[PDB]
Amino acid sequence: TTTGTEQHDLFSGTFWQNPHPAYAALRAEDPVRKLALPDGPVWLLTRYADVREAFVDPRLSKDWRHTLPEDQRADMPATPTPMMILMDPPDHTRLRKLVGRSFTVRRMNELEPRITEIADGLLAGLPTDGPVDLMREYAFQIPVQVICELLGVPAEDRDDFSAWSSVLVDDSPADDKNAAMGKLHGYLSDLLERKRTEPDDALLSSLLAVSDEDGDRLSQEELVAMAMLLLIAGHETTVNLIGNGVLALLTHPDQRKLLAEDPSLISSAVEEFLRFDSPVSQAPIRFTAEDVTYSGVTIPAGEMVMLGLAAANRDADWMPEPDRLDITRDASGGVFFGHGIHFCLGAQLARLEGRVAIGRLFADRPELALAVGLDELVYRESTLVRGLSRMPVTMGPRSA
Numbered sequence: 438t439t440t441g442t443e444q445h446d447l448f449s450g451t452f453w454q455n456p457h458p459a460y461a462a463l464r465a466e467d468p469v470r471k472l473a474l475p476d477g478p479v480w481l482l483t484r485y486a487d488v489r490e491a492f493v494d495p496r497l498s499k500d501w502r503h504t505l506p507e508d509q510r511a512d513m514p515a516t517p518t519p520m521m522i523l524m525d526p527p528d529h530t531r532l533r534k535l536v537g538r539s540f541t542v543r544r545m546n547e548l549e550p551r552i553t554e555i556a557d558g559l560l561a562g563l564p565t566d567g568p569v570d571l572m573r574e575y576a577f578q579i580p581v582q583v584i585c586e587l588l589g590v591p592a593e594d595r596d597d598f599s600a601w602s603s604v605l606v607d608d609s610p611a612d613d614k615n616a617a618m619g620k621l622h623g624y625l626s627d628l629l630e631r632k633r634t635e636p637d638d639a640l641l642s643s644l645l646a647v648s649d650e651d652g653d654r655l656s657q658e659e660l661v662a663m664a665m666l667l668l669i670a671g672h673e674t675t676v677n678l679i680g681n682g683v684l685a686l687l688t689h690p691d692q693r694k695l696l697a698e699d700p701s702l703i704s705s706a707v708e709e710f711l712r713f714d715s716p717v718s719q720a721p722i723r724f725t726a727e728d729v730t731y732s733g734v735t736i737p738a739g740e741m742v743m744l745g746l747a748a749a750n751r752d753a754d755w756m757p758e759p760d761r762l763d764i765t766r767d768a769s770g771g772v773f774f775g776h777g778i779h780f781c782l783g784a785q786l787a788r789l790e791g792r793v794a795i796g797r798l799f800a801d802r803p804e805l806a807l808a809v810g811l812d813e814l815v816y817r818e819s820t821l822v823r824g825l826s827r828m829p830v831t832m833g834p835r836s837a
């Protein structure tokens with residue numbers, strides 16, 4: 438709950454339907470908020486400038502060991518599995534540097550024609566007369582197929598791969614979500630050992646070959662962790678980019694008709710969807726190495742911090758009229774992909790998938806409409822994520 442003039446629900450009740458008035462309430466009246474979450478307390482930065490500068494704040498680290506007393510941490514491993522997103526320099530830098538050599542913005546762009554055939558394929562298999570769940574049938578699909586094309590997952594293994602991927606996004610997130618984790622992990626290892634014998638154009642083959650101006654390469658353990666990471670960070674988030682962006686246009690006809698007339702605005706549109714309804718609403722947990730101070734509030738060392746990306750993006754100090762959806766905007770400096778050394782590695786691929794999935798969906802089905810009321814929509818009860826479990830839509834006649 439909120440503590441200001443008017444008390445909004447936080448991470449319960451109405452929050453999950455629409456967290457934005459609660460974010461507006463926090464930015465205004467309680468910008469650095471200690472939340473009594475079930476697991477442990479966590480501080481929430483909602484103001485733009487706070488979040489923006491917290492990302493590049495050295496006193497904020499990804500090492501969870503900062504919560505344990507100084508002597509007790511000289512014993513514990515830093516991370517369970519070597520994913521760079523869990524690491525600080527110089528350990529993160531070494532992995533980021535290597536991945537970046539092969540996972541280039543160029544490869545990200547060269548998938549564009551391939552992505553289109555996935556969307557068009559999926560669109561071609563959707564009935565003129567709905568109702569159809571646009572999430573499970575379309576938005577759930579594009580990000581996982583694209584990731585296969587990037588990694589080079591054999592066409593045979595792709596049904597099995599997407600099957601396990603759905604568990605992570607929308608399923609029984611308890612023990613059943615972790616069952617698919619070990620299955621996807623195992624498959625990718627065996628895949629890497631197959632890629633060693635038979636190489637290809639794909640990124641997994643590319644990553645195996647990457648040395649540097651020191652002869653440093655990715656170890657087996659690091660390779661498969663990276664493969665697993667690209668999947669987790671690149672699936673659910675991009676799904677919800679699609680989910681949220683489609684929903685944004687459906688609820689704003691004025692803007693849907695702007696895009697209809699000028700389909701080149703899609704690139705500008707996807708930018709403002711990431712702002713207007715940030716799919717990753719909360720940044721992965723950070724830790725205080727020492728007393729930081731934001732908007733008057735001093736977070737003591739050893740505390741868990743959370744950066745309100747969704748909140749910081751609708752901040753009026755940064756963005757004029759921050760609650761109005763304008764796809765023609767010239768936005769610059771949103772915190773939806775993050776900031777600093779942890780900036781979204783697949784930022785450009787995400788944008789591509791976004792523009793293709795959304796742009797082609799509307800061009801192919803100009804009569805698209807929600808097949809249920811706005812309030813009937815169920816949103817996932819996830820802390821980090823802002824997105825739908827189901828989105829019933831009526832497709833309409835295909836345009837030829």
Ligand code: HEM
Nearest residue numbers: 521522670671674675678721773774775779781782783787
């Ligand atoms: C679809 C919209 C997406 C959003 C809103 C998003 C958001 C983010 C954010 C905020 C971070 C920084 C996390 C932090 O600093 O704690 C991040 C990191 C990352 N993302 Fe994305 N992401 C998206 C799509 C993707 C895609 C498609 C990929 C595929 C490669 C991807 C891969 C990664 C990776 C590998 C990192 C770790 C960066 C590092 O630690 O150096 N993301 N993402």
Ligand SMILES: [Ca+2]
Nearest residue numbers: 593594595597
């Ligand atoms: Ca098989």
